[PDB]
Write an enzyme that holds these catalytic residues in place. Sequence first.
Site, PDB file in Angstrom:
ATOM      1  N   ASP A  25      -9.936  26.503  -3.625  1.00  0.00           N
ATOM      2  CA  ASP A  25     -10.778  27.627  -3.270  1.00  0.00           C
ATOM      3  C   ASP A  25     -10.352  28.483  -2.078  1.00  0.00           C
ATOM      4  OD1 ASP A  25     -14.378  27.855  -2.735  1.00  0.00           O
ATOM      5  OD2 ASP A  25     -12.865  29.345  -3.298  1.00  0.00           O
ATOM      6  N   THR A  26      -9.849  29.679  -2.352  1.00  0.00           N
ATOM      7  CA  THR A  26      -9.441  30.587  -1.290  1.00  0.00           C
ATOM      8  C   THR A  26     -10.684  31.206  -0.663  1.00  0.00           C
ATOM      9  OG1 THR A  26      -9.178  32.285  -2.996  1.00  0.00           O
ATOM     10  CG2 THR A  26      -7.181  31.215  -2.176  1.00  0.00           C
ATOM     11  N   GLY A  27     -11.804  31.119  -1.373  1.00  0.00           N
ATOM     12  CA  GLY A  27     -13.042  31.672  -0.859  1.00  0.00           C
ATOM     13  C   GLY A  27     -13.761  30.709   0.063  1.00  0.00           C
TER      14      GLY A  27
END
Lengths: 99, 99
Positions: A25-27
């Site tokens: 997850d880059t978020g």
Amino acid sequence: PQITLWQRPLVTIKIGGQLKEALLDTGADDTVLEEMSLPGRWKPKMIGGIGGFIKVRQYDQILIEICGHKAIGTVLVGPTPVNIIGRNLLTQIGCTLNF
Amino acid sequence: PQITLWQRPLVTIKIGGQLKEALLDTGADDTVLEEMSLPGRWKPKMIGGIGGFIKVRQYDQILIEICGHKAIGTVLVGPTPVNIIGRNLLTQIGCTLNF
Ligand SMILES: Cc1cccc(C)c1OCC(=O)N[C@@H](Cc1ccccc1)[C@@H](O)C[C@H](Cc1ccccc1)NC(=O)[C@H](C(C)C)N1CCCNC1=O
């Protein structure tokens, strides 16, 4: 390796002598995992996602083996719907977003 | 462009004749933008997050120029803290997770 996004970027990690599936997850600024047994002391903390906040436990110096690669960082344990590999761990394995 | 993850991967987007900054979230199946005004009509829809569920308005066929790249898809608007570009769009701009 290279990962397209036509499906959820799920990968297998190894932690606490246990095997799981965590979403890359880059978020996510931090790493949060579903309730599991972890050795050592921890610290209460609260993170605020889309639906609100959740009470998780902060673990520092925890070794995680993401898709083979070994890394160590701060892992959060709580009532999350899915295992999340946040940027604190993603930058250690050298994950980069491209296009 | 290649984006490292030492900081939140914010990208400059253009929707509804408006300029905004959105997060490239690989842990988001859909795209949800903050409260704003839009032309087309919508349909009540809820999405599950980390702290609970929020109610958003859905929109189909919404043009979005994500960082010099025009793409079109379903956008959602509601009580989201940050702007989120999910995978329903990330694939349209050939965004790939890599390490
Ligand atoms: C899963 C999904 C389906 C359809 C549509 C959407 C938008 C979807 O995604 C909703 C969602 O909660 N996604 C999360 C991962 C997810 C998938 C499935 C179930 C639950 C969660 C993650 O990607 C993004 C979300 C963004 C965010 C929102 C508000 C404030 C700050 C950040 N990030 C966070 O919550 C992170 C957590 C994980 C450490 N976070 C919270 C503390 C501050 N910083 C930070 O980075």
